[PDB]
Design a protein around this motif. Structure first.
Motif, PDB file in Angstrom:
ATOM      1  N   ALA A 171       1.016  -1.180   0.065  1.00  0.00           N
ATOM      2  CA  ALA A 171       0.145  -0.035  -0.043  1.00  0.00           C
ATOM      3  C   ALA A 171       0.736   1.545   0.085  1.00  0.00           C
ATOM      4  CB  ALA A 171      -0.924  -0.217   1.338  1.00  0.00           C
ATOM      5  N   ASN A 172       2.029   1.238   0.708  1.00  0.00           N
ATOM      6  CA  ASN A 172       3.168   2.421   0.673  1.00  0.00           C
ATOM      7  C   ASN A 172       3.659   2.703  -0.966  1.00  0.00           C
ATOM      8  OD1 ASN A 172       2.380   3.011   3.433  1.00  0.00           O
ATOM      9  ND2 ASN A 172       4.309   2.018   4.059  1.00  0.00           N
ATOM     10  N   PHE A 173       4.082   1.466  -1.386  1.00  0.00           N
ATOM     11  CA  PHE A 173       4.461   1.518  -3.010  1.00  0.00           C
ATOM     12  C   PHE A 173       3.322   2.059  -3.611  1.00  0.00           C
ATOM     13  CE2 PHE A 173       8.558   0.213  -2.741  1.00  0.00           C
ATOM     14  CZ  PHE A 173       8.662  -0.759  -1.996  1.00  0.00           C
ATOM     15  N   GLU A 174       1.933   1.621  -3.576  1.00  0.00           N
ATOM     16  CA  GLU A 174       0.880   2.017  -4.376  1.00  0.00           C
ATOM     17  C   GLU A 174       0.579   3.471  -4.111  1.00  0.00           C
ATOM     18  OE1 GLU A 174      -2.644  -0.444  -4.020  1.00  0.00           O
ATOM     19  OE2 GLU A 174      -1.520  -2.088  -4.755  1.00  0.00           O
ATOM     20  N   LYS A 175       0.654   4.100  -2.915  1.00  0.00           N
ATOM     21  CA  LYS A 175       0.612   5.454  -2.514  1.00  0.00           C
ATOM     22  C   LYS A 175       1.593   6.195  -3.137  1.00  0.00           C
ATOM     23  CE  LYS A 175       0.390   8.282   1.666  1.00  0.00           C
ATOM     24  NZ  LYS A 175       0.138   8.473   3.194  1.00  0.00           N
ATOM     25  N   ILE A 176       2.892   5.949  -3.081  1.00  0.00           N
ATOM     26  CA  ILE A 176       4.113   6.843  -3.601  1.00  0.00           C
ATOM     27  C   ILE A 176       3.757   6.818  -5.209  1.00  0.00           C
ATOM     28  CG2 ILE A 176       6.600   6.750  -3.962  1.00  0.00           C
ATOM     29  CD1 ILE A 176       5.287   8.092  -1.240  1.00  0.00           C
ATOM     30  N   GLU A 177       3.574   5.518  -5.732  1.00  0.00           N
ATOM     31  CA  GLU A 177       3.257   5.579  -7.152  1.00  0.00           C
ATOM     32  C   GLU A 177       2.152   6.626  -7.642  1.00  0.00           C
ATOM     33  OE1 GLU A 177       2.578   1.429  -8.872  1.00  0.00           O
ATOM     34  OE2 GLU A 177       1.433   2.648 -10.451  1.00  0.00           O
ATOM     35  N   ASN A 178       1.168   6.501  -6.924  1.00  0.00           N
ATOM     36  CA  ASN A 178       0.091   7.302  -7.256  1.00  0.00           C
ATOM     37  C   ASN A 178       0.263   8.904  -7.055  1.00  0.00           C
ATOM     38  OD1 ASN A 178      -1.524   5.046  -8.235  1.00  0.00           O
ATOM     39  ND2 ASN A 178      -2.918   4.959  -6.421  1.00  0.00           N
ATOM     40  N   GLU A 179       0.899   9.052  -5.934  1.00  0.00           N
ATOM     41  CA  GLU A 179       1.314  10.530  -5.788  1.00  0.00           C
ATOM     42  C   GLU A 179       2.444  11.075  -6.639  1.00  0.00           C
ATOM     43  OE1 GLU A 179       2.301  10.366  -1.345  1.00  0.00           O
ATOM     44  OE2 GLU A 179       0.381  10.595  -0.790  1.00  0.00           O
TER      45      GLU A 179
END
Lengths: 757, 55, 54
Positions: A97-105
């Protein structure tokens, strides 16, 4: 001790499945351990931890993506400190979820920076467009184009709107920055006037053809002024949001640059642990685990402490015990390294990896390689140059460790710096004793040679008359000659015309002697190897007849050479025997009863005895070793055929191959002569030309001539013949030295460790 | 190796013992619809006695 | 060597069968709750019919 391959043991580990993850983590953190695979069924969809490893592979791909996006923004990654592994429970869900957060951000903030910066440029272009357009059914357009396109642009407008377009243009007050590339472009505003939509389509098609941009504008100056006040308001609002967008971008990018270090460590440790766990065996009823590992003998207790900690760091109580295995496969091979010894070990391992407890060539190589090289490279001038280069790399070490590594050549020579220093230093030593700097002597040595007054004694006294007209030879006879000499090569042998005959006699005999000595060391190292394996048969039927064969040829050859250098002298020179001919005559049992005299009393009997004893050693190596081995394996109730073929080929190399290897060391002489004469001609048709009878012409000539000499000397000798002598010194070392004792067959020690992160 | 061979037997026995416990407890769980009836009869008898008191 | 392995193997053998007995006690705790639920459902079902009738 580092003279041999370091001691190890194979162990079998009993592992409780909850402790097991933490156990593997502590073993990889310790890093002294290599696992043995017990799962032949292992594959991407068959490995016990399919999803956990597959999820770790994806998190590593996600890590690489977020790292690349931060590096595209030129923001430095944190690159310091260290962290623990993730626990065995599914905390990976929050990391994903942290990788998906940083990817989307990152995708969002790229989109927002582009949108706001693009809109800011578009409104800035619209400000300049309105400022010029304010000076002026009907129809019109206004826009912006690169100034160099204007002559073709107006011509094309007058072609499509045939002969009829009112237009104007002006350069913008500064060039404008590209939203993607950051280039600054000398754009110009334009305005175009017409009637109806049919002409609007033609002017717009040509604008697009020249990649120009059109903008909407009001029909009157008063409305254009009101729109310009709107645009000024919009630019300030866009600047405010652009500043806030940059502040949010800096927060996101800098937070990611900190997190990436921690996430890199966590993902690498998880992938490593789950990959190592797949090596365990699991039977159909099984719930616990069983595994095996190789470890250094000093650290079989350290792995048991790492297992105990893995349990203590877990909810499970099982201490995870092991046992030392006995029916073992051959363990991996290792030796310690430091700044100096590392390069010398690398050049061993690149040729081969020793068997378990085998003698390590590297400690002998620390000298032997620099020595073979400096015999090949023994110019005092090049010795200084090689030393200065290596010293510069050592003195600048702490700076060079921070510099570029992508220059692999610079990185390689810097990685060699300590070994390169030692071979350069020995090339000073050999250069001094050989008394050669740039094919010139040092005058520090005394004279063995005879001054002209020494010939006045009637004996050879015609030299004193003939020397005024023709070439003359010193006979070196007693009473004329200066007698025995304590320095290196006498300085006289650089200026004398016959020098190469005398100097080649030295380099030829020297290459033979050193080669014989190194083969005698190689068989002596074979004895130590056979003693370290504690095998009576390898010593008694191998080493003993091998060294007797070698000594019965080699000892006589060296004795003859040293005897001639003691028993003969200048007055004995007429009818002096040939050393090589006595050696071949001995080997052939064929003294010719005539011509060249025997060297000493009873020598024919000695020659016969030596070659007969050598020839009697050969059958023991060929057959008696295989036959005793056959009787041992037949009594213990192995193929005699394969053993006989292998040992026959080995015995040929141990005998006739070693005879040939005596000649192989002539590579020493060969490279030395080439190096010396390359240097001689480079002096003879460069440096010599710079000397002149006037001060200005001489000084200028010398400067340019020596600069040309240095360039050629570096390219030919320091670089190219340097690399040749480097490889040939190692060729002799790897082949006609190491093949006597280094078996060089084995697995490199490649421990499973977090130190590879 | 005799170590893991003995452990594999205890792991088999452990996997059996938990499954036997499931079977025994499932047979008791099926009795709940029978043991319920004596309490249902007491509620009937209570409402009968209250109904007679209202009469 | 092998005696301490055999001691820890005996402990691991006891440990996995003790885990199965702990899981059997979790099965017991679940089963008595489910038993009281299913008994209670049938009690309340006929008790409601009884209350409606009277």
């Amino acid at each position: 001790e580092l003279f041999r391959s370091e001691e190890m043991t194979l162990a079998q580990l009993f592992l409780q499945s909850e402790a097991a993850y933490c156990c593997v983590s502590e073993l990889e953190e310790l890093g002294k351990v290599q696992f043995r695979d017990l799962n032949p069924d292992v594959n991407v969809f068959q490995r016990k931890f399919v999803n956990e490893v597959r999820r770790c592979e994806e998190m590593d791909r996600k890590l690489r993506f977020v790292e690349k996006e931060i590096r595209k923004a030129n923001i430095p990654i944190m690159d310091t400190g260290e962290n623990p592994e993730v626990p065995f429970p599914r905390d990976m869900i929050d990391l994903e979820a942290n990788f998906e957060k940083i990817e989307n951000e990152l995708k969002e903030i790229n989109t927002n920076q582009e949108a706001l910066k693009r809109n800011f440029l578009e409104l800035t272009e619209l400000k300049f467009i309105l400022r010029k357009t304010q000076q002026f059914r009907l129809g019109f357009v206004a826009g912006v184009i690169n100034r160099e396109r204007i002559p073709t642009f107006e011509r094309m407008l007058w072609r499509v709107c045939r002969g009829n377009v009112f237009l104007r243009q002006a350069e913008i007050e500064n060039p404008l920055e590209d939203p993607v590339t950051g280039d600054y472009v000398h754009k110009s505003v334009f305005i175009i006037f017409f009637q109806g939509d049919q002409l609007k389509n033609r002017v717009k098609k040509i604008c697009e053809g020249f990649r120009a941009s059109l903008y909407p504008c009001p029909e009157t100056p008063q409305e254009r002024k009101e729109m310009a006040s709107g645009v000024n308001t919009r630019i300030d609002d866009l600047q405010m949001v652009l500043n806030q967008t940059e502040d949010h971008r800096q927060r996101v990018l800098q937070a990611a640059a900190k997190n990436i270090r921690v996430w890199f460590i966590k993902v690498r440790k998880m992938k490593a642990i789950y990959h190592t766990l797949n090596l365990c065996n699991i039977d159909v009823t099984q719930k616990c685990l069983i595994a095996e590992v190789w470890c250094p003998v000093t650290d079989l207790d350290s792995i048991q402490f790492a297992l105990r900690r893995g349990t203590e760091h877990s909810g499970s109580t099982v201490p995870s015990i092991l046992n030392r295995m006995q029916t073992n496969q051959t363990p991996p091979t290792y030796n310690k390294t430091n700044k100096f010894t590392h390069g010398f070990q690398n050049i061993v391992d690149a040729y081969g990896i020793g068997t378990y407890r085998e003698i390590n060539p590297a400690p002998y190589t620390v000298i032997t390689f620099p020595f073979l090289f400096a015999v090949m490279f023994g110019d005092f001038g090049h010795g200084i140059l090689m030393t200065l280069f290596a010293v510069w790399m050592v003195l600048r070490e702490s700076r060079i460790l921070s510099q570029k590594n992508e220059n692999e050549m610079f990185s390689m020579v810097f990685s060699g710096r300590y070994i390169i220093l030692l071979m350069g230093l020995f090339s000073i030593y050999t250069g001094l004793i050989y008394n050669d700097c740039f094919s010139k002597s040092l005058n520090i040595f005394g004279s063995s040679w005879s001054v002209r007054p020494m010939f006045t004694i009637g004996n050879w006294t015609e030299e004193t008359l003939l020397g005024s007209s023709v070439l003359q030879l010193n006979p070196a006879i007693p009473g004329v000659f200066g007698g025995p000499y304590p320095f290196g090569i006498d300085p006289i042998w650089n200026i004398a015309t016959n020098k190469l005959t005398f100097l080649n006699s030295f380099k030829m005999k020297m290459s033979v002697i050193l080669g014989i000595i190194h083969m005698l060391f190689g068989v002596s190292l074979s004895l130590f190897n056979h003693i370290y394996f504690k095998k009576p048969l390898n010593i008694y039927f191998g080493f003993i007849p091998e060294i007797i064969f070698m000594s019965s040829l080699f000892g006589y050859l060296v004795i003859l050479i040293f005897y001639k250098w003691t028993a003969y002298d200048a007055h004995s020179s007429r009818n002096a025997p040939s050393l090589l001919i006595h050696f071949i005559n001995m080997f052939l049992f064929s003294y010719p009863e005539s011509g060249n005299a025997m060297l000493y009393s009873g020598q024919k009997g000695i020659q016969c005895f030596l070659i007969v004893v050598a020839m009697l050693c050969v059958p023991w190596m060929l057959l008696f070793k295989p036959l005793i081995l056959r009787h041992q394996y037949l009594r213990k109730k192995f193929d005699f055929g394969d053993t006989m073929v292998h040992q026959a080929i080995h015995t040929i190399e141990y005998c006739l191959g070693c005879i040939s290897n005596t000649a192989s060391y002539l590579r020493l002489w060969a490279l030395s002569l080439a190096h010396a004469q390359l240097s001689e001609v480079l002096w003879t048709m460069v440096i010599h030309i710079g000397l002149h009878v006037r001060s200005l012409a001489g000084g200028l000539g010398l400067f340019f001539i020596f600069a040309a000499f240095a360039t050629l000397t570096v390219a030919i000798l320091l670089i190219m013949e340097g690399l040749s002598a480097f490889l040939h010194a190692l060729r002799l070392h790897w082949v006609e030295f190491q093949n006597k004792f280094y078996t060089g067959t084995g697995f490199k020690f490649l421990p499973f460790s977090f130190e590879h992160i | 190796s005799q170590g893991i061979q003995q452990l594999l037997q205890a792991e088999k026995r452990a996997a059996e013992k938990v499954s036997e416990a499931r079977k025994r407890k499932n047979r008791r769980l099926k009795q709940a619809k029978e043991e319920a009836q004596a309490e249902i009869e007491q509620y009937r008898l209570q409402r009968e006695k209250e109904f007679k008191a209202k009469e | 060597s092998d005696a301490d392995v055999q001691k820890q193997i005996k402990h691991m053998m006891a440990f996995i069968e003790q885990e199965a007995n702990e899981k059997a006690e979790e099965i017991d705790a679940k089963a008595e709750e489910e038993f009281n639920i299913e008994k209670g459902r049938l009690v309340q079902t006929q008790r409601l019919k009884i209350m409606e009738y009277y």
